Amino acid sequence: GSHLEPTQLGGLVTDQLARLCDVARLDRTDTETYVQTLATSLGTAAERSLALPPTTATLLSDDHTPVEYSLAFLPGATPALRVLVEPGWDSGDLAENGRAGLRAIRAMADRWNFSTDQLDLLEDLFFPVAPAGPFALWCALELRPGGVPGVKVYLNPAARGRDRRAETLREALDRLGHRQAFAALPPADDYPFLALDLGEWAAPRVKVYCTHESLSAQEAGEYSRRDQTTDFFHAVAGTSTRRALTCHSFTDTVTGRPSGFTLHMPVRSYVEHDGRARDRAADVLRRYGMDNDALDRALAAVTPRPLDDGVGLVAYVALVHQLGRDPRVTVYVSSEAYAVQPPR
């Protein structure tokens, strides 16, 4: 059973997650495992009344809910479900938020038998005494059949100050052995996140994110190593330049070449309401042979509201390229535990 009430933050988000697990076709056992895992990862936030303000005005979501969902669509397959959480959100300041986030990762490492050595190598870079914002630690869980999730940790290159973003990222990559990865990154306006895969890997796997304030479709296609990336840009943007995020995945330390590239488009910034955002995402999924029906079921799993009564439920749509795999489209879906942003 559940110790949580629908008037508590953890009750709302576990209800959403359980419904999403059904869309992802997870059985009852894995569903129970992952719903409890989400509640545990939130710590004391799970029991917090939704009538109180969000404890932390987090960047994780627009209304400051410390949870966001995503669905990864491959051609002809049921989408894979992931959840992003801020384990330290119910803390009083950024330093304690980071401490609690690391405690949560360590608990997961013990439970599922993986090492935090590669994350431990970086602690002084990402968890200084008086950290700068905008966040300290997020955790993404891939909710895999079987009940053992994939774990990724998201870290803040600005933790030692905005002026040290590149210094922190470059030193982190060097410590991980990725001494040629920084040279492969495109010009950028920010390095908002560094993500580390945690699990059964003898060498670090890292994802570097770059913000582009004024990306064009042509530049997006250039950065992708093309034609599918430019078409995706236009399909999601509704189009000369747009704000977007790229990420660059490095899975070997030898070449300095990325093995993956993702273009993330904040569709919530381009449309009047979520009906329009759903329409663009649905058309992209359908054109690539993906499970567009499952997208509609996922939105209904999260909230019963009419899509045109707000914007931001569909937060981002991304096109993921990875050597050796078919392209995937990821749709990011907000929890809206605290507020619905009004239509434009």
Ligand SMILES: Cc1ccc2c(C[C@H](N)C(=O)O)c[nH]c2c1
């Ligand atoms: C592809 C993507 C990019 C950024 C984010 C954030 C941080 C914040 N909400 C933002 O939009 O910058 C949460 N989930 C994301 C997913």
Ligand SMILES: CC(C)=CCSP(=O)(O)OP(=O)(O)O
């Ligand atoms: C930027 C944030 C918070 C999340 C991006 S989604 P992700 O990194 O989990 O996507 P993949 O690991 O590439 O499947």
